[PDB]
Amino acid sequence: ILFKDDFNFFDEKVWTKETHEPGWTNQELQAYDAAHVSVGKDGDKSVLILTAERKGNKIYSGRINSKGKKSFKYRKIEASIKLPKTNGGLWPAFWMMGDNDKQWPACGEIDIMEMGEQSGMAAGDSEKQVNTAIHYGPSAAAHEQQYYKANVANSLQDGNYHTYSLDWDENNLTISIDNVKFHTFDISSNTYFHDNFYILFNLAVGGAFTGITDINKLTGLKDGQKVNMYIDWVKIL
Amino acid sequence: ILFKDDFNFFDEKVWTKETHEPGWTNQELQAYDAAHVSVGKDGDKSVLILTAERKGNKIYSGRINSKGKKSFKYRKIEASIKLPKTNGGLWPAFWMMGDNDKQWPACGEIDIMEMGEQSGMAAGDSEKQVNTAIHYGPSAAAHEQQYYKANVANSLQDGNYHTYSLDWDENNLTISIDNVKFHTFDISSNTYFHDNFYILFNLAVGGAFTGITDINKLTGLKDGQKVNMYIDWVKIL
Numbered sequence A, B: 001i002l003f004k005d006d007f008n009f010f011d012e013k014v015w016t017k018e019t020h021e022p023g024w025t026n027q028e029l030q031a032y033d034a035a036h037v038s039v040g041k042d043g044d045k046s047v048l049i050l051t052a053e054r055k056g057n058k059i060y061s062g063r064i065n066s067k068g069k070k071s072f073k074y075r076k077i078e079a080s081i082k083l084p085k086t087n088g089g090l091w092p093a094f095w096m097m098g099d100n101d102k103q104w105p106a107c108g109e110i111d112i113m114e115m116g117e118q119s120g121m122a123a124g125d126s127e128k129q130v131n132t133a134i135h136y137g138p139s140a141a142a143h144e145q146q147y148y149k150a151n152v153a154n155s156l157q158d159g160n161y162h163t164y165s166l167d168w169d170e171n172n173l174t175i176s177i178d179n180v181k182f183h184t185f186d187i188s189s190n191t192y193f194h195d196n197f198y199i200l201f202n203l204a205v206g207g208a209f210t211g212i213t214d215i216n217k218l219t220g221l222k223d224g225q226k227v228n229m230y231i232d233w234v235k236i237l
């Protein structure tokens, strides 16, 4: 184990909490702030807690990253995450971007896990439908993305922690869920995935991906409701 | 050349015109019927024509396939297609499904070209943004999909014909647009892409892919409007 965070405390030497207004990316409904990121207890477990909350028409949630603090290359990254029910507009993600100063998507993006996509709600398997993706290109106008989407066998929103893994070498990005291979992206001649990448976790609320960008269609998070995303640990082997 | 249709006439030994109610697939707004498929002339060019039109709240368009009539395996297929401006909910596609009686998606699906996606309008490059994809898996519950999307250099909705190509061997599916390689899907160990596939062309109107499933939001086909998708030719080499 080269690195492990058990989230006994919020380590500011590793993580930064983000602050953005609604609409900052992907027509998202939440404001990100420091107050909706905490470390706490879930039973016997030390966990990072991202809390989505709604008061009136105002929506808050949490997002952290290890940019300029913790980045790695050609190593295995795993995180144990307990996801909320996403149906009706929640958008949790475990992902990485290039640890350099290049504007997105030139920095590179690996989406290890996201749930909450529009089509999953329409098909009635929002609890099983996972997206994994890579984004790259020298600019936004030249943005390129590869996706794989599938239902896993059983609910990942089942009140349990699940293991999300990326295996990374010169040739391949291999995503696994509870130690079962989900998909492999070929990067052997992709120039954007051979540098240091930092880690992100967030719980977005609505946005293009969920197909919900009007608070009137946000059934997934109600007035007075708080909803948590729990990360028990993250490690780099 | 194994096969070439110049569309001097509609050959019922190769092609079948499809009839479906609105919302048959993907929450699409259009009815498909035989009256909205024709063969005719675009100047000197003999063309297959798929016509989308709106009479009040009734939307009609055209869809054809060569199931049980014309299918192939490990051949290059190209088509020369002129597209309408898709912005505001039009959804043209050139694609393939396995020539067997397995229920979708166990038949396999190759989407060589589709345009008109939500994100294309949101990225203000609706004339340039193309999706390519493969769908497979034993049931609708176990639906798996790989997709690539990017903007091509030049408008594909510019009043001219463009060439859409699939190269297909036992290892690779390679989509090209105007002889520029767009994406390669690895099918080397994917069991769903090693039998005969038939061809489809269609012009859907609205649907989940467009993010417009409500006729009130459909700005791309107004009341009293008529739009044409033109295929000059298709060939298998």
Ligand SMILES: CC(=O)N[C@@H]1O[C@H](CO)[C@@H](O)[C@H](O[C@@H]2O[C@H](CO)[C@@H](O[C@@H]3O[C@H](CO)[C@@H](O)[C@H](O)[C@H]3O)[C@H](O)[C@H]2O)[C@H]1O
Binding pocket: B024, B025, B026, B092, B093, B095, B103, B104, B109, B111, B114, B131, B132, B133, B135, B209
């Ligand atoms: C690339 C992309 O985003 N979408 C795919 O492209 C094509 C062309 O744009 C879409 O039309 C596909 O939609 C899927 O097509 C299947 C075959 O037409 C549909 O399957 C059919 O479903 C009906 C109703 O349930 C059944 O009665 C038919 O037997 C079955 O073939 C499927 O529902 C639809 O999602 C995209 O895959």
